[PDB]
């Protein structure tokens, strides 16, 4: 367009930039004021966030949630400072909040799971359905809980494993607790031959469970016929013992059951099979 | 830019701060008024929440929902106080509500599952499909319910387990109740040899179930041939008894069935097999 | 700041509170008017909700949906009541509606599933794919429906078990009705030895079902060779009978099949397999 | 506050209500006119909904979608009436529209599945991938379709079952149509001994399938060795027949195969095992 | 209220309707003009939708998307028509746009999957990963594709089945194409006795695959020992052939393998089993 | 209404249309201007989209993402053009943007999956975890990658199969790469009789793996007893070789292992069984 | 319409374009100013994003999150510039922000998961549940972690595999760490004959584990009878050793157990089976 796209417009057109010097000075002053407002807002936001966190901690509020609200307050104040600065810039204060809301929505979509994990961790720590050192199962993975972080928990399996579970999945599934009740129940299933004397087996098992000191005598001690298996008669034995002695009692009772069953002549049956013959 | 970025602008420029002292005093007064508004709003919010909770508790409303809505009222009032305080400050009253809405959306995304669990727990307590001490199954985990908390239920398995289930998953799945009906039905599957006399087996089982005092005689007592198994004829026996006697009746009936079947000469068959010889 | 933070500002500054007496009186009048508006709105909302529920119930509308929409009307009217009250207070009427909007969104985040269950209950009660008293299957659980509550369905398993299913899950999955069609079909699979005479077996099975009075002769009665099993020839028998006689007909036909097969010399084959011998 | 909360403000203060008699009359007139507007809006909404449904039914539009959108227009008109009435009362129409939007959002969250089922039912009826009377499978459940309702389909399994499937789930999964194609293919798997003559077996099967009049001779008829099984040589036989004769042809061909193989000396092999002996 | 609810207000109060006749005439004129505007908008929307559809179809655009966005334009234009008409009625257009938005949101929640099905159909038709007559697998169901409709795809299984699959699910899962490559590979697993000569078996299989004309000699033809099975040595044979000859080559090669293995004395082993005697 | 619905209103009422000729001309001019604006906006949108696509392609931006932003810019510009045109028509510019927003929301609900697939494809191209010609597994389906299109990826399975997978699914699941490392590990499980000499077996396996030139001697070569099986002692052999020689090394080592095990007298055991005899 | 659609309107109508020359010049000036604003905004956005990233990197902020926030600021500033330019051209500044919000919503739906992957990757690096070179399990896939990229992780399975896992799935599932604890536990299951001497077996196993120097003697070393198997007495042996020696200890202990069990005469039992003879 002849001279419209040349020095008549670029390089300030010689005198066009000079004639607009006052406008440039005003814009520079506005930008400087906006930057100063930004700096002041950041400083006051950090100060007020620290102050409110300290105040909340004093009022018996948990550290994690107090930090969460302190960070939320800090983010709100810095967003307010950005609103004020861009209003001083003159961007209608509406597109500014729209852009900030879009950015916050993107950040929320990014976090979602992490924030849910944080909330679940807060709930876990304040209800404490399980605590450090307590043996519990967490939805298919069982072990001793070491500690509960803000986003995840660390638990040690009996074999020395280290397992980290996000806190969000913890509250969604079941919380299988092994070490809450001081007393728990063992269950033995014993297979005997079909010709074995039921009364003798019951009496022997009753003697075995009677001779154990770690079995709670004041609770139920079930020794009864359970079901007629395909190749073996199955007896069910249920006894109660302290959670600490649960495993040892199981092994001791099983070893004894084996020993007296061998001595008494009661036979543990191999898989029975019945064969009929024809010639061809 | 020469002297624009030096003491001519920083350190109050000597007299610029002196001239702006009036505006600084006005802003300080505004900030003090806003802080006083925040304090009085927090105090009145706490008082109003306590008052409304106390009032509605008397109106036969459940404690959990009353506390929840009292907390909602308190949060609403503190948000309103923040709106008023920042309007006094001059943060356009629209960016403030937008940022508060974004924070509330983040908090809602955080809670989601937990707050749904709270709603579910409210539903369970007043409908009471199950209650403390009642033996129920909650989708693969069965035990005695101990208590129904606001977010979760603690239930004890028959073996001494302590099970914690979030309330939200409870209502989503089936509620399998064992102890609501005072009378329940047992089922026995008895395998006998193919050459066994059907009439004799049926008559013996009928005698066995006739002599049991804990079996309800006024209800159906089926002793019928069920299906021709691969290696055994299977009879089905169904009897009804009070829920407290179910297991004892099952065990006693099975043990008797074994005794009279042994005495009558009816044989429980091992896995049957027919073998044909070929020489190679 | 010298005396700015002392009695010159606190305790009403002596005369500052006195000079502000008119504004405090005006604010007290505003608060009293707002509270009176709240009370009037609550009472009128309750009256209007009761009136509309009573009116629409008479117009052949279901009780559950009528109660739901009456509660919705009551909540709406109290929402307008709070809007008007806080406008009287002077809370800009926009932050107010934003606050109740966030509260309603949180309430929805509570509901989802339970409100869906209520809607599903409405659909079930109005379409009645099943009705109380009949035997149905609702996605893996079978039993007799006892009643259909507004949130859940109570059904009794054939063994006396009490089963509670949320209404929402029922409509999402299949609804199998065992008792809708008055006539149903049994299916027998009979395994016979490979050397058995096919014509004799078919003729005997035809005789057995011909003499059953509870089998519908006007419908198809298939007795045909179904498949050549690994160890047995399998015959399929399909007969139709009234739903009330299905199990009894099944049991009687099976017992007869066994009796005449024993008499006719037709042998039910045990698991067949032949062995080739080598010495090593 | 002395006499602020006494007869001086309650019970119309003697003359305060009288001085406000004109304002009370104006409010009463406003309420009466608002109720009249509501009644007029309701009646005109009903008239317009009926008129539009009648008009669109004539224009070859399906009844279900026409009724749905007529109800939508009815709800829109009553919503407009509520807006007009509540705004003319002076509620600013903004809280009014927000409350109605929240109620509509709650209703939509409640429906969701039901409305999706209605849309799916419309799609199924207008595309008719299956039609009432034909035998089809809908994702694991097979039977004859009885009818397609607006919300769900009733379908009868071959054994007399009555199964109701929500329309939404139907369109999400596969629609397996057993009866669309008039001709279908049977498949036989025949196990014969390893020493059996392959040519003789193939020739016998070819004779068997050649003599069947219901087998389409113009289509492929494969009789070929399929795979060398663990204990048997497996032949695959594939023939085509009209969908009405599919089952009968299967049974007839299987029975003829058994009869000819018995006569021809070809042996169906029992499960094979090879045994090596050692003494210990 | 004395005479407030009598002929003094109902039945037009005699002269009140006479006085308001002018307003009634104005309202009637407004309603008539609004209805005329609705009619004009509807007809012009239909015309514009048809015109834009035709013009864009002329511009090499697919018919499905053309009809879709033409319907979108029609719905948009009728939406503007409703906005204009209801604004001329005096409904402020804000409640109008909110109600129409709520209706559109409900319609979208209804459609959702169906509209996704249309988009998936468009993607499949324009990318054509498969086409009519091409034998493919779409996630567990395999067959010859017949046609691809806008919402669902119809395909015929090899046995005469008719399969209808929504387009949305097809694109979400794997699309396994069976006939895109003109050449494909067969795999044979041959079990032989442990004492069989490996070199003889390998040489015989090599001759068998050498004597087949339909096996591509220019591609890999592996005949190697694959793994030492429990009872049999398993050889793997992999050959390549044209997709049209894949099945026939498999059957021919298997039948030959059987014939020359019988001729050469190489034995296909039955499940070998080892037995030790002890007397008891 | 007498003559209100007749020629006095229709057919322009004779002179009513004539008296409004200027207004009709103004409306026609407005419509013509709006259509011209639409045409100009479409042309300029296409031009600017082409220009920006070319510029981004020149600025080392990937072709797919450049095309995506070009299409986004074109759609945005045509949206602004429609806004301006309907503002010229006079449709309040707010209902217009609401209608376009609803249309865009519907289009987004339609695409959703496709747009996610496009983004996943862009990520897959730019990080290239796999590349054309490289053999990988992508969640249960393995084969050689042919190409990665914008919406989906194509793969050839080792048997010549054709698989097309959406890109969105690829990034969601694991990307299992077979051909990244130049060296990979084989694993042999060898079952031997319980009486076999462990030292002899280990020495023979070591001799076998030493003589293989394609086995990397600089890496670990594990030959150790792994576990005591039910019927066989299982040795584990792990060797490393270049990815190109993996299968050939496996086959050669297995065949040798068989040969020297036969030569040395070490026996591969058949399934062992212990039988105890009793007479009945 | 006569001459309305001809040169009187097109080609600038001769003088109509000339009369509007000033308006065209003003529009061209506005467009040039808008383009200059766009260029300046892009330049300043790039400069600010480069500066802020460098600024926060110095403040001990992670590189990934710093780059993410820098990109967010750049996109925000370019959006602000677009708002300013489209305000200058005169598009009401409202439809502009609506279109940009729709585009951002589409982009968010596109990335959605990928952005969540970036957030998960940021979470992983700071808490480092696993680190490069550390052998861990990622929910069904186990291997040595090579590196943690921003969207995915590369991990090498023990057999030379290359495994790529999206970061999002990592944080959602369990994280099992095999190499965090320096000491881990072994578990041996040893099956012995029923007649074997329990004390002898226990003493021999204890002697085996006492003689291993790599087994931690200060931790539990359980050698107890575990359960009575179908055909074998099963002993459980649990020992603890350093993670580096786990597999070697396992192999050595197993080989010894075999050797001294062979020497001591203790027999590993083959699958026992019980056979009863009958003649037919």
Numbering used by the authors:
A (entry chain B), B (entry chain C), C (entry chain D), D (entry chain E), E (entry chain F), F (entry chain G), ...: 1 to 280
Lines quoted from the article behind this entry:
MscS resides in the inner membrane of E. coli and greatly increases its open-state probability under moderate membrane tensions (5.5 mN/m in liposome patches [Kung et al., 2010; Haswell et al., 2011]), thereby permitting passive diffusion of both ions and water. All available MscS structures, obtained through either X-ray crystallography or cryo-electron microscopy, show that this channel is a homoheptamer, featuring a transmembrane domain and a cytosolic domain. In the transmembrane domain, so-called helix TM3a from each protomer lines a central pore that serves as the ion conduction pathway, flanked by helices TM1 and TM2, which face the lipid bilayer. Specifically, in each protomer, the TM1–TM2 hairpin changes tilt relative to both TM3a and to the membrane plane, and in turn, results in widening or narrowing of the central pore.
